């Protein structure tokens, strides 16, 4: 605080102002197409011959 001789009126103190921020999210779209080409082939667990 300011030292002010008791005679005189005193000093005028100031203030400060705030701020803001703003954000939009991004958008994500993975997709798969499932051919027969991908359903048919043998998957590892399957036995040999008669999968």
């Amino acid at each position: 605080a300011p030292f002010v001789a008791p005679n005189v009126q005193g000093r005028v103190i100031k203030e400060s102002g705030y701020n803001t921020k703003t954000f939009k999210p991004a958008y994500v779209k993975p997709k798969h197409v499932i051919d027969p080409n991908m359903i048919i082939p043998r998957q590892p667990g399957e036995a040999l011959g008669t999968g």
């Binding site: 002010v4 001789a5 005679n7 005189v8 009126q9 000093r11």
Partner: protein, 124 residues
């Protein structure tokens, strides 16, 4: 500091009489600023060319120098380089204030503050 005094003597302690500063009810405005010279309480003070408070000095020179136009009444004493608080507005007893030489009569002591918020006048 050490010896008492044994001789008889008179108790002439001291004296005091008020310094009444105000002679009116205008607005009492005050500022503060650096001083360019030694300044006493309630001295009338101008601002030198460098913008530092200086005791008022009429006829300070072929052109009036800025010490020559009074700007306020020092509210507390200060040495050079120090900050002086000082009045800029109000109605002030001309007798309480410190004045330059040859700025003797109240007719002059008013003319020095002929427009500002400072007015200078008698007490009754």
């Amino acid at each position: 500091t050490s010896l008492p005094n044994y001789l008889a003597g008179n108790g002439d302690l001291g004296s005091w009489e008020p310094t009444q500063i105000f002679a009116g009810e205008a607005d009492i405005v005050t500022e503060g600023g650096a001083a360019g010279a030694d300044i006493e309480i309630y001295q009338v003070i101008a601002k030198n060319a460098a913008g530092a408070m200086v005791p008022h000095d009429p006829t300070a020179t072929e052109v009036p120098a800025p010490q020559s136009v009074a700007i306020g009444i020092a509210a507390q004493p200060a040495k050079s380089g120090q900050n002086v608080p000082y009045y800029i507005g109000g109605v002030f007893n001309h007798a309480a204030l410190g004045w330059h030489a040859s700025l003797d009569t109240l007719a002059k002591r008013q003319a020095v503050f002929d427009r500002t918020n400072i007015h200078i006048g008698n007490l009754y």
